[PDB]
Design a protein around this ligand. Structure first.
Ligand code: ZN
Ligand code: ZN
Lengths: 299, 359
Protein backbone atom coordinates (compact mmCIF):
# COMPACT_ATOMS: atom_id res chain seq x y z
CA UNK A 1 0.00 0.00 0.00
CA UNK A 2 1.63 3.24 -1.26
CA UNK A 3 0.86 7.03 -0.84
CA UNK A 4 1.00 10.20 -3.03
CA UNK A 5 1.93 13.56 -1.47
CA UNK A 6 0.94 16.83 -3.11
CA UNK A 7 2.27 20.35 -2.61
CA UNK A 8 0.83 23.49 -4.18
CA UNK A 9 3.26 26.19 -5.43
CA UNK A 10 2.77 22.05 -8.31
CA UNK A 11 4.84 19.26 -6.67
CA UNK A 12 3.86 15.54 -6.65
CA UNK A 13 5.58 12.49 -5.22
CA UNK A 14 5.14 8.75 -4.88
CA UNK A 15 6.18 7.24 -1.53
CA UNK A 16 5.85 3.98 0.38
CA UNK A 17 4.85 3.72 4.09
CA UNK A 18 8.25 4.99 5.25
CA UNK A 19 7.84 8.28 3.40
CA UNK A 20 10.58 7.41 0.89
CA UNK A 21 10.35 9.42 -2.29
CA UNK A 22 10.24 6.88 -5.07
CA UNK A 23 9.17 9.21 -7.91
CA UNK A 24 8.47 12.97 -8.00
CA UNK A 25 7.62 15.51 -10.71
CA UNK A 26 7.56 19.35 -11.01
CA UNK A 27 4.70 20.66 -13.18
CA UNK A 28 4.96 24.40 -14.00
CA UNK A 29 1.68 26.20 -13.28
CA UNK A 30 0.36 29.33 -11.58
CA UNK A 31 -2.76 28.96 -9.40
CA UNK A 32 -3.53 32.65 -8.76
CA UNK A 33 -7.32 32.57 -8.08
CA UNK A 34 -7.53 29.40 -10.19
CA UNK A 35 -8.66 26.48 -7.97
CA UNK A 36 -11.10 24.53 -10.23
CA UNK A 37 -8.43 24.22 -12.93
CA UNK A 38 -5.56 23.58 -10.44
CA UNK A 39 -7.33 20.53 -9.00
CA UNK A 40 -7.75 19.05 -12.54
CA UNK A 41 -3.98 19.23 -13.22
CA UNK A 42 -3.39 17.60 -9.83
CA UNK A 43 -5.82 14.67 -10.21
CA UNK A 44 -4.27 14.22 -13.67
CA UNK A 45 -0.65 13.98 -12.50
CA UNK A 46 -1.78 12.07 -9.40
CA UNK A 47 -3.09 9.18 -11.50
CA UNK A 48 0.00 9.44 -13.80
CA UNK A 49 2.51 8.16 -11.21
CA UNK A 50 0.33 5.04 -10.83
CA UNK A 51 -2.63 4.19 -3.16
CA UNK A 52 -4.14 4.33 0.32
CA UNK A 53 -4.36 8.14 0.33
CA UNK A 54 -3.24 11.57 -0.89
CA UNK A 55 -1.87 14.26 1.45
CA UNK A 56 -1.78 17.92 0.42
CA UNK A 57 0.49 20.48 2.02
CA UNK A 58 -0.39 24.11 1.22
CA UNK A 59 0.15 27.75 2.18
CA UNK A 60 -2.94 29.22 3.90
CA UNK A 61 -5.40 28.69 6.71
CA UNK A 62 -6.98 25.21 6.71
CA UNK A 63 -9.76 23.30 8.45
CA UNK A 64 -8.48 19.70 8.43
CA UNK A 65 -11.74 18.40 9.95
CA UNK A 66 -13.68 19.37 6.80
CA UNK A 67 -10.45 19.46 4.77
CA UNK A 68 -11.29 22.96 3.55
CA UNK A 69 -8.82 25.60 2.53
CA UNK A 70 -10.26 28.44 4.54
CA UNK A 71 -7.94 31.00 3.07
CA UNK A 72 -4.76 31.26 1.03
CA UNK A 73 -3.75 34.90 0.89
CA UNK A 74 -0.81 33.98 -1.37
CA UNK A 75 -2.90 32.23 -4.03
CA UNK A 76 -6.13 34.17 -3.29
CA UNK A 77 -8.24 31.10 -2.35
CA UNK A 78 -11.46 31.45 -0.30
CA UNK A 79 -13.22 28.38 1.15
CA UNK A 80 -12.19 25.74 -1.34
CA UNK A 81 -13.42 22.27 -0.28
CA UNK A 82 -10.24 20.55 -1.53
CA UNK A 83 -10.86 17.26 0.40
CA UNK A 84 -14.31 16.98 -1.33
CA UNK A 85 -13.28 18.26 -4.83
CA UNK A 86 -10.84 15.32 -5.09
CA UNK A 87 -13.47 12.67 -4.22
CA UNK A 88 -14.85 13.65 -7.62
CA UNK A 89 -11.68 12.00 -8.99
CA UNK A 90 -10.98 9.42 -6.20
CA UNK A 91 -14.33 8.82 -4.32
CA UNK A 92 -13.24 6.37 -1.57
CA UNK A 93 -9.53 7.20 -1.23
CA UNK A 94 -8.95 9.17 2.04
CA UNK A 95 -7.57 12.67 1.27
CA UNK A 96 -6.11 15.04 3.94
CA UNK A 97 -4.87 18.64 3.80
CA UNK A 98 -2.55 20.71 6.04
CA UNK A 99 -0.40 23.81 6.52
CA UNK A 100 2.95 23.23 4.74
CA UNK A 101 4.94 24.06 7.85
CA UNK A 102 2.96 21.36 9.77
CA UNK A 103 3.75 18.90 6.96
CA UNK A 104 7.45 19.59 7.24
CA UNK A 105 7.15 19.22 11.06
CA UNK A 106 5.72 15.72 10.74
CA UNK A 107 8.85 15.01 8.66
CA UNK A 108 11.08 16.28 11.51
CA UNK A 109 8.94 14.37 14.00
CA UNK A 110 9.59 11.01 12.29
CA UNK A 111 12.78 11.36 10.25
CA UNK A 112 14.45 14.57 11.33
CA UNK A 113 15.06 16.02 14.74
CA UNK A 114 11.99 14.67 16.47
CA UNK A 115 13.57 11.28 17.25
CA UNK A 116 14.89 12.98 20.42
CA UNK A 117 12.85 16.10 21.15
CA UNK A 118 9.29 15.51 22.26
CA UNK A 119 8.55 19.26 22.24
CA UNK A 120 10.01 22.04 20.16
CA UNK A 121 9.13 24.61 17.55
CA UNK A 122 9.88 24.65 13.80
CA UNK A 123 10.17 27.90 11.90
CA UNK A 124 10.35 28.26 8.11
CA UNK A 125 12.43 31.02 6.63
CA UNK A 126 11.94 31.60 2.95
CA UNK A 127 9.38 33.34 0.85
CA UNK A 128 7.31 33.93 4.00
CA UNK A 129 7.24 32.95 7.71
CA UNK A 130 5.85 29.74 9.08
CA UNK A 131 5.70 28.31 12.58
CA UNK A 132 4.66 24.97 13.98
CA UNK A 133 4.92 24.00 17.68
CA UNK A 134 5.19 20.43 18.90
CA UNK A 135 4.03 19.37 22.46
CA UNK A 136 4.70 15.72 23.54
CA UNK A 137 5.17 14.88 19.87
CA UNK A 138 1.91 16.66 18.98
CA UNK A 139 1.46 19.61 16.62
CA UNK A 140 -0.58 22.41 18.27
CA UNK A 141 -3.61 23.42 16.18
CA UNK A 142 -5.48 25.52 18.68
CA UNK A 143 -9.23 25.99 18.81
CA UNK A 144 -10.12 26.25 15.09
CA UNK A 145 -7.00 24.53 13.71
CA UNK A 146 -5.36 27.88 12.91
CA UNK A 147 -2.64 28.23 15.50
CA UNK A 148 0.82 29.16 14.47
CA UNK A 149 -0.01 32.22 12.36
CA UNK A 150 3.30 33.78 13.50
CA UNK A 151 4.06 35.63 10.22
CA UNK A 152 1.21 38.03 10.88
CA UNK A 153 2.34 39.14 14.31
CA UNK A 154 3.03 42.83 14.30
CA UNK A 155 6.75 43.53 14.42
CA UNK A 156 6.36 47.08 13.18
CA UNK A 157 3.17 48.89 14.14
CA UNK A 158 2.32 51.14 11.21
CA UNK A 159 4.58 49.20 8.86
CA UNK A 160 4.36 47.67 5.43
CA UNK A 161 1.08 46.63 3.96
CA UNK A 162 0.75 42.82 4.11
CA UNK A 163 -1.21 40.48 1.94
CA UNK A 164 -3.42 39.76 4.96
CA UNK A 165 -4.80 43.34 5.01
CA UNK A 166 -2.83 44.42 8.06
CA UNK A 167 0.23 46.52 8.55
CA UNK A 168 3.60 45.75 10.00
CA UNK A 169 3.45 41.99 9.78
CA UNK A 170 6.62 40.08 10.61
CA UNK A 171 6.41 38.28 7.26
CA UNK A 172 6.89 41.68 5.59
CA UNK A 173 10.17 42.21 7.40
CA UNK A 174 11.65 38.87 8.15
CA UNK A 175 11.36 37.07 4.80
CA UNK A 176 11.86 37.56 1.00
CA UNK A 177 8.86 39.93 1.03
CA UNK A 178 11.03 42.43 2.86
CA UNK A 179 13.32 42.90 -0.15
CA UNK A 180 10.41 43.87 -2.39
CA UNK A 181 8.91 46.16 0.29
CA UNK A 182 12.20 47.88 1.10
CA UNK A 183 14.19 47.53 -2.20
CA UNK A 184 12.22 50.37 -3.85
CA UNK A 185 12.83 52.92 -1.15
CA UNK A 186 16.45 51.76 -1.56
CA UNK A 187 16.59 52.27 -5.37
CA UNK A 188 17.18 56.07 -5.26
CA UNK A 189 19.39 55.79 -2.13
CA UNK A 190 21.54 53.26 -4.09
CA UNK A 191 21.42 54.41 -7.78
CA UNK A 192 24.39 52.44 -9.18
CA UNK A 193 23.17 49.20 -7.59
CA UNK A 194 23.63 45.79 -9.22
CA UNK A 195 20.38 44.36 -7.81
CA UNK A 196 17.00 44.69 -9.54
CA UNK A 197 15.22 41.31 -9.00
CA UNK A 198 14.21 41.19 -5.29
CA UNK A 199 14.02 37.44 -4.84
CA UNK A 200 15.96 35.58 -2.22
CA UNK A 201 18.64 34.14 -4.54
CA UNK A 202 19.22 37.37 -6.42
CA UNK A 203 19.58 39.44 -3.21
CA UNK A 204 21.66 36.68 -1.63
CA UNK A 205 23.91 36.66 -4.75
CA UNK A 206 24.46 40.50 -4.89
CA UNK A 207 25.18 40.51 -1.15
CA UNK A 208 28.01 37.99 -1.23
CA UNK A 209 29.31 40.24 -4.08
CA UNK A 210 29.45 43.24 -1.68
CA UNK A 211 26.58 45.30 -3.28
CA UNK A 212 25.61 47.73 -0.47
CA UNK A 213 21.81 47.80 -1.14
CA UNK A 214 21.71 43.97 -1.08
CA UNK A 215 23.91 43.97 2.00
CA UNK A 216 21.44 46.28 3.76
CA UNK A 217 18.44 44.28 2.68
CA UNK A 218 19.86 40.94 3.81
CA UNK A 219 21.17 42.52 7.09
CA UNK A 220 17.84 43.90 8.15
CA UNK A 221 15.95 40.76 7.11
CA UNK A 222 18.20 38.94 9.61
CA UNK A 223 17.56 41.33 12.51
CA UNK A 224 13.83 40.85 12.03
CA UNK A 225 14.12 37.14 11.75
CA UNK A 226 16.10 37.35 15.05
CA UNK A 227 13.27 39.28 16.63
CA UNK A 228 10.71 36.81 15.36
CA UNK A 229 12.59 33.87 16.76
CA UNK A 230 13.25 35.64 20.03
CA UNK A 231 9.50 36.45 20.30
CA UNK A 232 8.88 32.73 19.83
CA UNK A 233 11.45 31.89 22.57
CA UNK A 234 10.05 34.38 25.08
CA UNK A 235 6.51 33.07 24.29
CA UNK A 236 6.62 29.31 24.08
CA UNK A 237 9.85 28.61 25.98
CA UNK A 238 10.72 25.55 23.80
CA UNK A 239 13.65 23.13 24.33
CA UNK A 240 14.79 24.01 20.79
CA UNK A 241 13.89 25.95 17.68
CA UNK A 242 14.65 24.36 14.30
CA UNK A 243 15.00 26.64 11.34
CA UNK A 244 14.04 25.19 8.00
CA UNK A 245 13.14 26.26 4.55
CA UNK A 246 14.72 27.25 1.28
CA UNK A 247 16.20 30.31 3.01
CA UNK A 248 18.81 28.08 4.73
CA UNK A 249 20.46 27.77 1.32
CA UNK A 250 21.83 31.26 2.10
CA UNK A 251 22.42 30.55 5.76
CA UNK A 252 25.89 32.11 5.90
CA UNK A 253 24.13 35.53 5.41
CA UNK A 254 21.77 35.23 8.41
CA UNK A 255 21.97 32.28 10.89
CA UNK A 256 24.62 33.85 13.05
CA UNK A 257 22.76 37.15 13.18
CA UNK A 258 19.59 35.31 14.00
CA UNK A 259 21.64 33.83 16.85
CA UNK A 260 23.14 37.09 18.22
CA UNK A 261 19.65 38.34 18.80
CA UNK A 262 17.59 35.29 19.62
CA UNK A 263 20.21 34.10 22.10
CA UNK A 264 19.66 37.47 23.86
CA UNK A 265 16.25 36.32 25.05
CA UNK A 266 14.43 36.61 28.35
CA UNK A 267 15.30 33.16 29.82
CA UNK A 268 19.04 33.17 28.90
CA UNK A 269 19.80 35.41 31.89
CA UNK A 270 19.31 32.24 34.01
CA UNK A 271 22.11 30.17 32.35
CA UNK A 272 19.61 27.79 30.68
CA UNK A 273 20.01 28.13 26.91
CA UNK A 274 17.61 27.33 24.14
CA UNK A 275 19.23 25.45 21.26
CA UNK A 276 18.58 27.11 17.88
CA UNK A 277 19.58 24.75 15.12
CA UNK A 278 18.84 24.00 11.50
CA UNK A 279 16.97 21.13 9.80
CA UNK A 280 18.73 17.83 9.08
CA UNK A 281 16.30 16.92 6.22
CA UNK A 282 16.47 18.15 2.60
CA UNK A 283 14.08 20.25 0.47
CA UNK A 284 12.11 17.14 -0.58
CA UNK A 285 11.07 16.62 3.07
CA UNK A 286 8.01 18.91 2.60
CA UNK A 287 6.60 16.12 0.33
CA UNK A 288 7.62 13.34 2.72
CA UNK A 289 5.63 15.39 5.23
CA UNK A 290 2.41 15.63 3.26
CA UNK A 291 2.87 11.92 2.59
CA UNK A 292 3.22 11.34 6.36
CA UNK A 293 0.10 13.37 6.78
CA UNK A 294 -2.00 10.46 5.41
CA UNK A 295 0.17 7.69 6.88
CA UNK A 296 -0.21 8.84 10.55
CA UNK A 297 -3.97 9.27 10.38
CA UNK A 298 -4.28 5.82 8.79
CA UNK A 299 -2.32 4.07 11.62
CA UNK B 1 -5.91 3.07 40.99
CA UNK B 2 -7.46 5.43 38.37
CA UNK B 3 -11.12 4.73 39.17
CA UNK B 4 -11.27 6.76 42.44
CA UNK B 5 -10.08 9.75 40.41
CA UNK B 6 -12.66 9.41 37.69
CA UNK B 7 -15.53 9.00 40.26
CA UNK B 8 -14.19 11.76 42.56
CA UNK B 9 -13.78 14.41 39.75
CA UNK B 10 -17.17 13.58 38.40
CA UNK B 11 -18.42 14.37 41.97
CA UNK B 12 -16.79 17.89 42.23
CA UNK B 13 -17.65 18.81 38.57
CA UNK B 14 -21.33 18.56 39.59
CA UNK B 15 -20.99 19.44 43.28
CA UNK B 16 -23.89 17.13 44.11
CA UNK B 17 -24.78 13.86 42.35
CA UNK B 18 -26.41 10.36 42.91
CA UNK B 19 -25.00 6.85 42.57
CA UNK B 20 -26.78 5.93 39.29
CA UNK B 21 -26.16 9.46 37.94
CA UNK B 22 -22.42 8.67 38.45
CA UNK B 23 -22.59 5.09 37.07
CA UNK B 24 -23.86 6.19 33.66
CA UNK B 25 -20.75 8.22 32.86
CA UNK B 26 -18.42 5.63 34.26
CA UNK B 27 -16.86 2.74 32.26
CA UNK B 28 -17.28 0.01 34.92
CA UNK B 29 -19.73 -1.77 37.20
CA UNK B 30 -21.95 -0.90 40.18
CA UNK B 31 -20.09 -3.53 42.30
CA UNK B 32 -16.85 -1.57 41.71
CA UNK B 33 -18.62 1.77 42.20
CA UNK B 34 -19.96 0.70 45.61
CA UNK B 35 -16.42 -0.17 46.78
CA UNK B 36 -15.17 3.27 45.81
CA UNK B 37 -18.06 5.37 47.23
CA UNK B 38 -18.12 3.38 50.49
CA UNK B 39 -14.35 3.88 50.86
CA UNK B 40 -14.32 7.61 49.90
CA UNK B 41 -17.20 8.08 52.40
CA UNK B 42 -15.27 6.60 55.35
CA UNK B 43 -12.22 8.68 54.14
CA UNK B 44 -14.46 11.68 54.81
CA UNK B 45 -13.69 12.91 51.30
CA UNK B 46 -17.36 12.60 50.21
CA UNK B 47 -20.77 12.99 51.98
CA UNK B 48 -24.31 11.54 51.52
CA UNK B 49 -27.53 13.52 52.23
CA UNK B 50 -29.60 9.11 47.89
CA UNK B 51 -27.37 12.12 46.88
CA UNK B 52 -23.60 12.17 47.23
CA UNK B 53 -21.51 15.36 47.47
CA UNK B 54 -17.89 16.45 47.85
CA UNK B 55 -16.64 17.42 51.31
CA UNK B 56 -15.37 20.95 50.90
CA UNK B 57 -14.28 20.64 54.60
CA UNK B 58 -12.42 17.26 54.44
CA UNK B 59 -9.43 19.56 54.30
CA UNK B 60 -8.48 23.17 54.10
CA UNK B 61 -5.77 25.02 52.20
CA UNK B 62 -3.62 28.07 52.71
CA UNK B 63 -2.31 30.26 49.93
CA UNK B 64 0.25 33.10 50.01
CA UNK B 65 0.92 36.05 47.74
CA UNK B 66 4.40 37.50 47.91
CA UNK B 67 4.53 41.19 47.01
CA UNK B 68 6.75 44.34 47.17
CA UNK B 69 5.56 45.88 50.41
CA UNK B 70 3.38 43.03 51.74
CA UNK B 71 2.56 39.37 52.20
CA UNK B 72 -1.00 38.30 51.69
CA UNK B 73 -2.32 35.08 53.23
CA UNK B 74 -5.55 33.06 52.79
CA UNK B 75 -7.26 29.94 54.20
CA UNK B 76 -9.74 28.35 51.76
CA UNK B 77 -12.00 25.29 51.93
CA UNK B 78 -11.49 22.64 49.28
CA UNK B 79 -13.71 24.50 46.76
CA UNK B 80 -11.28 27.44 47.10
CA UNK B 81 -13.75 29.65 49.09
CA UNK B 82 -11.91 31.97 51.49
CA UNK B 83 -12.81 31.41 55.15
CA UNK B 84 -10.07 33.72 56.56
CA UNK B 85 -7.72 36.30 55.03
CA UNK B 86 -5.06 38.56 56.52
CA UNK B 87 -2.05 40.55 55.27
CA UNK B 88 1.22 41.60 56.84
CA UNK B 89 3.81 44.13 55.68
CA UNK B 90 7.13 43.15 54.11
CA UNK B 91 9.80 45.29 52.36
CA UNK B 92 12.78 42.98 51.50
CA UNK B 93 15.52 34.60 53.20
CA UNK B 94 13.58 35.89 56.25
CA UNK B 95 10.43 36.05 54.07
CA UNK B 96 10.02 32.29 54.69
CA UNK B 97 10.44 32.72 58.47
CA UNK B 98 7.58 35.25 58.26
CA UNK B 99 5.32 33.05 56.06
CA UNK B 100 5.65 29.88 58.15
CA UNK B 101 5.05 31.97 61.32
CA UNK B 102 1.89 33.51 59.78
CA UNK B 103 0.70 30.26 58.23
CA UNK B 104 0.22 28.64 61.64
CA UNK B 105 -1.65 31.80 62.91
CA UNK B 106 -4.36 31.61 60.13
CA UNK B 107 -5.41 28.11 61.09
CA UNK B 108 -5.93 29.13 64.74
CA UNK B 109 -6.53 25.85 66.56
CA UNK B 110 -7.50 23.87 63.40
CA UNK B 111 -6.26 20.27 63.11
CA UNK B 112 -2.94 20.23 61.24
CA UNK B 113 -3.58 16.82 59.57
CA UNK B 114 -6.32 18.66 57.66
CA UNK B 115 -4.09 21.35 56.23
CA UNK B 116 -3.62 19.73 52.80
CA UNK B 117 -1.12 22.15 51.33
CA UNK B 118 0.21 25.60 50.65
CA UNK B 119 0.19 27.49 47.38
CA UNK B 120 2.49 30.45 46.69
CA UNK B 121 1.71 33.10 44.03
CA UNK B 122 4.74 35.13 43.12
CA UNK B 123 5.87 37.38 40.31
CA UNK B 124 8.70 36.68 37.86
CA UNK B 125 10.16 33.50 36.49
CA UNK B 126 9.22 30.32 38.46
CA UNK B 127 9.78 26.59 38.02
CA UNK B 128 6.71 25.18 39.78
CA UNK B 129 8.10 21.70 39.21
CA UNK B 130 11.19 22.44 41.25
CA UNK B 131 9.52 24.84 43.75
CA UNK B 132 12.15 27.52 43.09
CA UNK B 133 11.85 31.13 42.08
CA UNK B 134 14.47 31.51 39.37
CA UNK B 135 14.24 35.30 39.11
CA UNK B 136 12.16 38.14 40.64
CA UNK B 137 13.44 41.49 39.36
CA UNK B 138 10.96 43.25 41.65
CA UNK B 139 12.08 41.56 44.94
CA UNK B 140 15.79 41.18 44.13
CA UNK B 141 15.73 37.38 44.21
CA UNK B 142 17.55 34.69 42.21
CA UNK B 143 17.26 30.82 42.35
CA UNK B 144 15.52 30.87 45.78
CA UNK B 145 14.26 27.45 46.87
CA UNK B 146 10.90 28.67 48.20
CA UNK B 147 9.46 25.10 48.32
CA UNK B 148 12.42 23.36 49.96
CA UNK B 149 13.14 26.27 52.39
CA UNK B 150 9.47 26.52 53.46
CA UNK B 151 9.17 22.68 53.53
CA UNK B 152 11.34 22.91 56.65
CA UNK B 153 8.20 23.88 58.57
CA UNK B 154 5.71 21.66 56.72
CA UNK B 155 7.60 18.55 55.47
CA UNK B 156 4.58 16.23 55.51
CA UNK B 157 2.62 18.79 53.40
CA UNK B 158 3.05 19.98 49.82
CA UNK B 159 4.13 23.49 48.86
CA UNK B 160 3.52 24.64 45.29
CA UNK B 161 4.86 27.89 43.85
CA UNK B 162 3.81 29.44 40.55
CA UNK B 163 3.86 32.61 38.57
CA UNK B 164 1.04 35.05 39.51
CA UNK B 165 -0.68 34.98 36.17
CA UNK B 166 -0.92 31.19 36.34
CA UNK B 167 -2.23 31.11 39.91
CA UNK B 168 -4.85 33.58 38.70
CA UNK B 169 -5.44 31.46 35.56
CA UNK B 170 -6.44 28.38 37.60
CA UNK B 171 -8.87 30.74 39.31
CA UNK B 172 -10.43 31.35 35.96
CA UNK B 173 -10.52 27.59 35.27
CA UNK B 174 -12.28 26.48 38.41
CA UNK B 175 -14.39 29.55 39.17
CA UNK B 176 -14.62 32.01 36.29
CA UNK B 177 -14.77 32.18 32.46
CA UNK B 178 -12.38 29.27 32.32
CA UNK B 179 -15.16 26.83 33.25
CA UNK B 180 -17.08 27.22 29.96
CA UNK B 181 -14.01 27.16 27.69
CA UNK B 182 -11.23 24.66 27.59
CA UNK B 183 -8.73 26.56 25.36
CA UNK B 184 -8.63 30.24 26.33
CA UNK B 185 -5.86 32.79 27.06
CA UNK B 186 -5.49 35.10 30.04
CA UNK B 187 -3.63 38.45 29.86
CA UNK B 188 -2.58 40.52 32.89
CA UNK B 189 -1.69 44.18 32.80
CA UNK B 190 -0.51 46.58 35.36
CA UNK B 191 2.75 46.03 37.11
CA UNK B 192 3.81 44.61 33.70
CA UNK B 193 2.27 42.20 31.20
CA UNK B 194 1.55 38.59 32.00
CA UNK B 195 0.11 35.80 29.96
CA UNK B 196 -1.16 32.35 30.63
CA UNK B 197 -2.58 30.24 27.82
CA UNK B 198 -4.75 27.26 28.81
CA UNK B 199 -4.75 24.14 26.49
CA UNK B 200 -7.28 21.29 27.25
CA UNK B 201 -8.04 22.87 30.59
CA UNK B 202 -4.28 22.87 31.32
CA UNK B 203 -1.80 25.77 31.62
CA UNK B 204 0.94 25.63 28.94
CA UNK B 205 4.28 25.75 30.87
CA UNK B 206 6.45 24.69 27.99
CA UNK B 207 9.85 22.96 28.23
CA UNK B 208 11.32 24.53 31.39
CA UNK B 209 8.14 26.11 32.89
CA UNK B 210 8.50 29.64 31.46
CA UNK B 211 6.16 30.07 28.49
CA UNK B 212 3.99 33.11 28.37
CA UNK B 213 6.58 35.85 28.83
CA UNK B 214 4.68 37.72 26.18
CA UNK B 215 5.67 41.03 27.70
CA UNK B 216 9.19 40.73 26.27
CA UNK B 217 8.24 40.01 22.72
CA UNK B 218 9.56 42.88 20.59
CA UNK B 219 6.73 45.12 19.36
CA UNK B 220 8.93 48.06 18.36
CA UNK B 221 12.52 47.20 17.24
CA UNK B 222 15.08 49.39 18.89
CA UNK B 223 12.43 51.25 20.98
CA UNK B 224 12.17 51.84 24.79
CA UNK B 225 14.81 50.13 26.95
CA UNK B 226 13.06 47.29 28.75
CA UNK B 227 14.15 46.49 32.37
CA UNK B 228 15.05 43.05 30.85
CA UNK B 229 18.00 44.38 28.73
CA UNK B 230 16.27 43.96 25.41
CA UNK B 231 14.85 46.99 23.61
CA UNK B 232 11.29 47.72 22.55
CA UNK B 233 9.53 45.12 24.58
CA UNK B 234 5.77 44.95 24.40
CA UNK B 235 5.54 45.49 28.13
CA UNK B 236 7.12 48.97 27.74
CA UNK B 237 4.21 50.13 25.53
CA UNK B 238 1.24 48.05 26.61
CA UNK B 239 1.28 48.49 30.44
CA UNK B 240 1.81 50.85 33.38
CA UNK B 241 5.50 51.14 32.27
CA UNK B 242 4.44 52.98 29.16
CA UNK B 243 3.63 56.05 31.26
CA UNK B 244 7.05 56.20 32.97
CA UNK B 245 8.68 55.81 29.42
CA UNK B 246 6.52 58.27 27.44
CA UNK B 247 5.30 60.56 30.27
CA UNK B 248 8.17 63.02 30.32
CA UNK B 249 8.47 63.34 26.50
CA UNK B 250 4.75 64.25 26.27
CA UNK B 251 4.83 66.94 28.99
CA UNK B 252 6.63 69.00 26.31
CA UNK B 253 3.75 68.55 23.80
CA UNK B 254 1.07 69.29 26.47
CA UNK B 255 1.41 72.11 29.05
CA UNK B 256 -0.67 66.06 35.26
CA UNK B 257 2.46 65.16 37.30
CA UNK B 258 2.22 61.51 38.56
CA UNK B 259 2.38 58.63 35.97
CA UNK B 260 1.15 55.73 37.99
CA UNK B 261 -1.75 53.97 36.26
CA UNK B 262 -4.64 54.92 38.56
CA UNK B 263 -3.37 58.51 38.38
CA UNK B 264 -3.28 58.67 34.56
CA UNK B 265 -6.63 56.91 34.32
CA UNK B 266 -8.49 59.20 36.72
CA UNK B 267 -6.96 62.27 35.00
CA UNK B 268 -8.10 61.03 31.64
CA UNK B 269 -11.62 60.52 33.03
CA UNK B 270 -11.41 64.16 33.96
CA UNK B 271 -10.70 65.09 30.36
CA UNK B 272 -6.97 65.77 30.43
CA UNK B 273 -5.56 65.57 26.90
CA UNK B 274 -2.14 64.20 27.77
CA UNK B 275 -3.45 61.44 30.06
CA UNK B 276 -5.99 60.51 27.38
CA UNK B 277 -3.32 60.24 24.66
CA UNK B 278 -1.32 58.04 27.09
CA UNK B 279 -4.29 55.92 27.99
CA UNK B 280 -5.05 55.65 24.26
CA UNK B 281 -1.65 54.46 23.08
CA UNK B 282 -1.36 51.95 25.92
CA UNK B 283 -4.59 50.43 24.60
CA UNK B 284 -3.31 50.31 20.98
CA UNK B 285 -0.11 48.53 21.99
CA UNK B 286 -2.06 46.24 24.24
CA UNK B 287 -4.26 45.68 21.22
CA UNK B 288 -1.20 44.57 19.17
CA UNK B 289 -0.13 42.21 21.95
CA UNK B 290 -3.53 40.52 21.92
CA UNK B 291 -3.65 40.38 18.12
CA UNK B 292 -0.24 38.65 18.25
CA UNK B 293 -1.55 36.20 20.87
CA UNK B 294 -4.50 35.42 18.62
CA UNK B 295 -2.51 34.83 15.41
CA UNK B 296 -0.26 32.73 17.51
CA UNK B 297 -2.19 30.51 19.85
CA UNK B 298 -5.63 30.96 18.33
CA UNK B 299 -7.68 30.80 21.60
CA UNK B 300 -11.50 30.54 22.00
CA UNK B 301 -11.60 33.67 24.07
CA UNK B 302 -9.07 36.03 25.66
CA UNK B 303 -9.48 37.25 29.29
CA UNK B 304 -8.09 40.65 30.29
CA UNK B 305 -7.26 41.25 33.95
CA UNK B 306 -5.92 44.20 35.90
CA UNK B 307 -3.03 43.60 38.33
CA UNK B 308 -3.01 46.42 40.82
CA UNK B 309 -5.66 48.05 38.58
CA UNK B 310 -9.27 47.79 37.47
CA UNK B 311 -9.61 46.54 33.92
CA UNK B 312 -12.62 48.87 33.29
CA UNK B 313 -10.20 51.75 33.49
CA UNK B 314 -8.53 50.43 30.36
CA UNK B 315 -9.58 51.66 26.87
CA UNK B 316 -11.28 48.37 26.03
CA UNK B 317 -12.76 49.68 22.78
CA UNK B 318 -9.29 50.45 21.35
CA UNK B 319 -7.93 47.11 22.53
CA UNK B 320 -10.73 45.28 20.78
CA UNK B 321 -10.60 47.57 17.66
CA UNK B 322 -7.00 46.48 17.22
CA UNK B 323 -7.15 42.97 18.49
CA UNK B 324 -10.10 41.83 16.43
CA UNK B 325 -8.14 42.77 13.26
CA UNK B 326 -6.31 39.41 13.16
CA UNK B 327 -5.75 36.65 10.64
CA UNK B 328 -8.69 34.37 11.55
CA UNK B 329 -11.18 37.22 11.35
CA UNK B 330 -10.58 37.68 7.60
CA UNK B 331 -12.17 34.24 7.26
CA UNK B 332 -14.78 35.72 9.63
CA UNK B 333 -13.64 33.96 12.87
CA UNK B 334 -14.13 36.44 15.64
CA UNK B 335 -12.26 35.69 18.84
CA UNK B 336 -14.06 36.69 21.98
CA UNK B 337 -12.17 39.27 24.00
CA UNK B 338 -13.42 40.13 27.48
CA UNK B 339 -12.50 41.27 30.96
CA UNK B 340 -12.57 38.99 33.94
CA UNK B 341 -15.58 38.46 36.17
CA UNK B 342 -13.53 37.50 39.21
CA UNK B 343 -12.14 39.94 41.79
CA UNK B 344 -8.86 40.57 43.74
CA UNK B 345 -9.28 37.51 45.93
CA UNK B 346 -9.05 35.22 42.87
CA UNK B 347 -5.25 35.71 42.91
CA UNK B 348 -5.23 34.05 46.34
CA UNK B 349 -7.94 31.51 45.38
CA UNK B 350 -5.71 30.87 42.37
CA UNK B 351 -2.83 29.91 44.64
CA UNK B 352 -5.18 27.75 46.72
CA UNK B 353 -6.45 26.05 43.50
CA UNK B 354 -2.81 25.31 42.78
CA UNK B 355 -2.87 22.92 45.69
CA UNK B 356 -6.44 21.80 45.37
CA UNK B 357 -6.38 20.92 41.70
CA UNK B 358 -3.30 18.81 42.28
CA UNK B 359 -5.13 16.38 44.62
ZN1 ZN C 1 -0.16 39.77 7.52
ZN1 ZN D 1 11.83 43.08 28.08
Amino acid sequence: GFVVSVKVELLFALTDLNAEIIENTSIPFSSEKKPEEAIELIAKNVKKMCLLGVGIAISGLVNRKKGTVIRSTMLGWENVALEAMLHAHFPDIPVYVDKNINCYTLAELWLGEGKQSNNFATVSVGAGLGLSVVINRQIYYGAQGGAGEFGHTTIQPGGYKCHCGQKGCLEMYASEFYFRNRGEELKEAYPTSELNDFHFDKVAKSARAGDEMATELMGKMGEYLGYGIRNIINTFNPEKVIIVGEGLHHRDLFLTKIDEIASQNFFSGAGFETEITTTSLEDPAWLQGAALLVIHQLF
